[PDB]
Amino acid sequence: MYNGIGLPTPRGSGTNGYVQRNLSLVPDILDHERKRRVELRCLELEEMMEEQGYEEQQIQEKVATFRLMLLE
Amino acid sequence: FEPLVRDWNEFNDINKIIIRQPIRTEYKIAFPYLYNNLPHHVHLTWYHT
Amino acid sequence: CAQQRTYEKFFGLLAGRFCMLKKEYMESFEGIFKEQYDTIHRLETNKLRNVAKMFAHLLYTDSLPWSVLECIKLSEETTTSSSRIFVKIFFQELCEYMGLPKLNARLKDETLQPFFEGLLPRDNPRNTRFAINFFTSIGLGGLTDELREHLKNTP
Amino acid sequence: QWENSFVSVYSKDNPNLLFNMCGFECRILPKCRTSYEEFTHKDGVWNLQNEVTKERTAQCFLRVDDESMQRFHNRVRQILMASGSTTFTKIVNKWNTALIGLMTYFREAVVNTQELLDLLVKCENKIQTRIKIGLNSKMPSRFPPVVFYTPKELGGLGMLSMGHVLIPQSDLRWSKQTDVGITHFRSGMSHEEDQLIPNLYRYIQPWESEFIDSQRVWAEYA
Amino acid sequence: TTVYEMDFLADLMDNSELIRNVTLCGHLHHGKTCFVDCLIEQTHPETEQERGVGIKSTPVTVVLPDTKGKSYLFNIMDTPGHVNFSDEVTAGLRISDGVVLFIDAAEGVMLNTERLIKHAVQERLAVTVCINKIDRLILELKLPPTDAYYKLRHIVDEVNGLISMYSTDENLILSPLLGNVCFSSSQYSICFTLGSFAKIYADTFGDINYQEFAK
Amino acid sequence: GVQFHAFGRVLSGTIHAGQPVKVLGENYTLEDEEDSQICTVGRLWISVARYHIEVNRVPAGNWVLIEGVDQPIVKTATITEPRGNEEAQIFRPLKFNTTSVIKIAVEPVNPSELPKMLDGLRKVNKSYPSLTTKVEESGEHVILGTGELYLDCVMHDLRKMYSEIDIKVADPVVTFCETVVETSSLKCFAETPNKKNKITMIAEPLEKGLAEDIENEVVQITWNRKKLGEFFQTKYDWDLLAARSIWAFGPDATGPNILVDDTLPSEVDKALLGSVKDSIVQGFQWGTREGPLCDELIRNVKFKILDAVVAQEPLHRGGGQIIPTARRVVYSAFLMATPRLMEPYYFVEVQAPADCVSAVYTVLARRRGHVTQDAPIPGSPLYTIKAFIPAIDSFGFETDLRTHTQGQAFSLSVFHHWQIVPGDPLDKSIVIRPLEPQPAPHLAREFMIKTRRRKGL
Ligand SMILES: Nc1nc2c(ncn2[C@@H]2O[C@H](COP(=O)(O)OP(=O)(O)OP(=O)(O)O)[C@@H](O)[C@H]2O)c(=O)[nH]1
Ligand SMILES: [Mg+2]
Known about the structure:
The structure is cut from a larger assembly and holds one copy of chain A, two copies of chain B, one copy of chain C and two copies of chain E. Chain B is mostly loops.
């Protein structure tokens, strides 16, 4: 493989142009996430309250306690 | 055969290449135009017969 | 290269490339440095200096491993004057080639101090006197007087 | 004149200081500057040493100048041009003297100049070819190496050789870029078998060692 | 460096219920360009070539008679099949309405064939098959006739499994009974469906009902 | 000549010669009619393989080669009636199955002919429907293509027909992507030039399934938030609050990243957040597109807004100077707590005789292969091999394979999926020997140091 080695023509060069290969080559994160913990603490409480009533007052009661009782 | 006819470039800037496999003449003859600057009087050979 | 005109690292380089080519020549070189430390007086000072720069090349080429110093116990009674000149040429070359900072640094770290013990005498005092005097004569003031300060603190 | 001059700056962008002196082409590179990678290798490299700290602080790389290669080549050309009225042994004595006068002057810049090595191959084979032409044939088997290199005592011609070495080759593109190394070995002149013909370069002693040798020899004699 | 027939072509264009827009797709070298060539010589007795690989598609529109003689106008988008040139296929796949996937009898389904059935079902086209290059089972591979049956059945069942894999609705399963698949040999001038073969059986022999036969 | 013949289907109507018609380009939406150039028809042709039979008229339902609609249009065009306007739409431009991933830089030999070369490039961008050419801000012309043979034919046409300039061409490299491996354990929050609006957002990694769904149009947000929510919760137990929080998708309509909005107490500030979402998503998509590391696309990442201190009356100060604020929030989180690089893979299917299987095995080893499957072909004397290969090492793999085995084997290749390149992209303790091949621990490092050197500076 003429891999960029050798002569174009070994013709007037005094050599046979034979090539070879060199054999001897070788802190808000927790506080922002508490408000994230608090986040579903309001929705999912108001959701699980919505499962047992969507009167928007009985769920606001379960959500209000879950917001105050958790933040305590 | 005897050669047909007979400075700086940027693409061969040796800091700006990635060399994973050395290009070798068999590739340079498989795809004459992709792998070669100034390919002239070259016949484009391919076959998967 | 022992038989050569003067030292050219040609033969150094060639033997080092063989070692680079197989481990067989690395253990060959372990045994060869053992052999030349055994047969060191068997030369003249000419041959002595060329083989000294041989092994110095080997060391600072990383071809020979710095463990080899285990073969060098720097007590006056066991040291050939011929071996004395050998190590002086060896370490002159090491210091003036790799430079004194990284030599003294490599002479310092414990990971090879087991071998270096024969070279740096602390347990027995008389060969400490002798060896510190020797490297002082060679002009390695740093290591020498650090070890002598250890000696001063010793009693 | 600015066209026959050459000015070379060394600053925080050029770490190399290149110059061109009596016949050599030198290039100094300190260790402080951008030699994160450093070697100690083939003798084309002098190791300059700071005489007060006695530490090696830079390396000088040597090459033969271009006009010195040209001068050697023109010298061989006139050996050949004015040799049709002389004997084989006179042509080979002129070759011997020219080649000794080059090799003993340069001596390690010749190792590092990959253009010399080709010059010397072609020039030696031109001398051999003129001796063949002197007989009436150039067949490569009527004239094995033994005919030329046999000393003048056994009846040979006595040529001195530097054309049977292998020429190192490596990947032109980066070789014009970044001093890449040596991967292949093109062949020099053709010998009838392995035959391993010796070399003038191995019997001449490098300068950088002669200068240390001399320092010590004259110091101790004084 | 067609007098009294292009008018007929024009009226065919004008009918718009005698034309069919089909894309000729498949894997590499599986018979497309030779199909088209032998076909244009059936109608007209009137980079790439050196490559032996087609790179960019070519369209042909020609007038073909069926097993009843009614001429049709056919829009045939001959594509390249090299997986690198799938671009061209997408082009045809928009501006046409059905796809004739050419499968090799000797190889079966490979990369581009399955990827093209995917591209064809996700663009909601019609899907037909030509199991081409059948002489490679008789002359080349030398197969007992029953194992030829086995191989053909296998190819059809595998392409069926894949076309079911990428499309939920079991609206169509391919089998020659429905008229989904030709059997072919582009170069040996043979292309036939169970329909056409049974009609040949009838026309040369007695009057047997070719439809119920083909079933 | 340079001109073409546009080729297309007439769905409705009937085209005739000289018929003045108005084109609808690819960018044209109904309220940007500059895109529509207005022209006529020179000839009309109908086709057999390479015979052009010229006609005067064609009705709907056929194909036709139209002469004259060349200069206005590129890959796709939608033709409508000229001077008779009712109102028109365009069909969504062609979608391709494979992603064009190979990269080739192009330059002339002497810059004097840079315009001529530019002519050439336009034309081939015309002819080849998947060619993606772009002039990169470092001043180069990169061509983006499918495979080695594809680009060979591209440059064949470039040098043969469209421009007769002599052209230098770089070696092929591939286009990369950026991703993360773990969450931004702490956040840097960007605030307006005029310090009005504070934007706190972190980054974290998605899972592959949903990102691929983003790609497949399975989770198209063209739905309402209800469908979004059932999708997400139903399938991957995403939170319904995560669904209410998900705003948009980034790089474009189809972007494998997601923007999420989770800070409930300020969440009810819909006066201000419902105002700013527009600039918020603009900065999101800009940041995702323009790349944090090497100017390349990111994928497979999820960003979360955790504190939006909005300026009361977020007037034009906010509205204008908040988009760079947003994208710097993105870069901040991303670069902050886990940069990583991603590179494409190629699927290779090798037909081979029974014996030469081992041969191909060895080849794939040299090139970081991972051959997956090898199986008989039923009814054939051949085995089929299926393997993966980094598109980096895919260069010459075909010809290498065929040469080593005397033509018997033969492979095709397709892009399949991206993957983590095994290096650490950001480590200064990694220096690169500038021409020998790197071992794996530093591929990513090298990969960036090279590409930025030509693009990122
Ligand atoms: N044995 C056999 N070979 C066939 C037959 N029909 C077509 N061929 C092959 O057809 C090839 C001609 O080119 P095509 O393969 O048809 O072109 P193609 O299928 O579109 O492949 P691409 O152009 O690259 O997409 C020849 O190599 C034949 O091998 C057939 O009936 N029997
Ligand atoms: Mg074809």
